Amino acid sequence: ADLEDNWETLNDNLKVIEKADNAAQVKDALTKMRAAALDAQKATPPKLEDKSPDSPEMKDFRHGFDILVGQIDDALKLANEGKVKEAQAAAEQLKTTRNAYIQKYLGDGARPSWVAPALSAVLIVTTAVDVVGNLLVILSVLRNRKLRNAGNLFLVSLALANLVVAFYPYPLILVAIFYDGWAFGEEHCKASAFVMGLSVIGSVWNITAIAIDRYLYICHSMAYHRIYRRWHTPLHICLIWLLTVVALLPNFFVGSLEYDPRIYSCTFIQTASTQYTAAVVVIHFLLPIAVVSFCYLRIWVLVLQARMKKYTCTVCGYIYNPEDGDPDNGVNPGTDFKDIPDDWVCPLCGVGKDQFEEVECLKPSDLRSFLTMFVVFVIFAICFAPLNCIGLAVAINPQEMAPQIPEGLFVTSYLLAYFNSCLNPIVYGLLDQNFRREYKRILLALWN
């Protein structure tokens, strides 16, 4: 057997020990991994093919292999006794000495020169804008009480999902570019991928929970106020985050959280299990996009039919807001002007509905800022649409569609997925006039 085929063999049996149940399954995997380690030792590397068999370049690899074999001897003594958790720890210790020592004259490192300066620039820009912008969102919602109670408590949850990915995984990815390879341990590798999982899936379900809250506030607005919202929304934020952790646990069993050299980041692997990836593309993308697309379609048909809209008085300038109503004149909050009985008159000048003109302009701050949150969703869809397509193609047939996907296309798609983390406060400033004022309020306070 060739050295290239043996490099895969002992690496494939190492993944078996991680998903093993008893010590006999570990002992059977350690026997195959030791025979492959002896075989790869009695083979010249393709990279150092020019280097002589006695010369000091190939002589260091021959002495380096015996260090890894002795580590299997220490691991098999634990496996004979019946220790699985102790032998799995010894297997991870041999895995670190198999990518640092053994991977010297081995590797298909044919990555184009543009992936390193782009990824890193995107990563610097994203991490810098995220830690500042999303922090200002947290600050503006915690300060402004009128904005917080306007269903923007979910924004704290979404901004924390965006922030957490900039503090732990993004900087480690940047170190993995400059040092060329994952410079941190396997425990730091699996965790970085998991943190990114919470940030991605958590953002999907936070956007959907917002689409439901903004669907119920415009459509079935009467029913909305009848149902409590005091303690309901902090409970929903807790539930959607626990659902995310539950959805991320099968990664620990399948073993899909490993280092990807293509994008220099320790992330989720699409080829590990085509059954679990299919569930991530459908249940955690295709389905939640479909329920949100319906939510905003029902809102847009109301705006198009000129339904829930502000009506201003052509006598004393009284602006009737459907979100406010007219409670002292019987109009309970959340009532459309087209539904108020014809006997109703202005509660300021007493002129009838006859002389009432609507605002033929929808502002992005109106109806709990429905337009901004819509833009937020469309932006999210754009960033994660190609990556979910790659994961969909591999799930169908990985035997022919996995090598068919270009390496350049994967980096281009993963660059967008990362960049989404800093884009959310940018759209709050440009579209939401109330957030814009609050951004200036905090920035002027930090100055003076």
Ligand SMILES: CCC(=O)NCC[C@@H]1CCc2ccc3c(c21)CCO3
């Ligand atoms: C289409 C499949 C895909 O590429 N999905 C996004 C990869 C994201 C981001 C990192 C991470 C970690 C764990 C995890 C997931 C991800 C999906 C479910 O478990």
Ligand SMILES: [Zn+2]
């Ligand atoms: Zn009036």
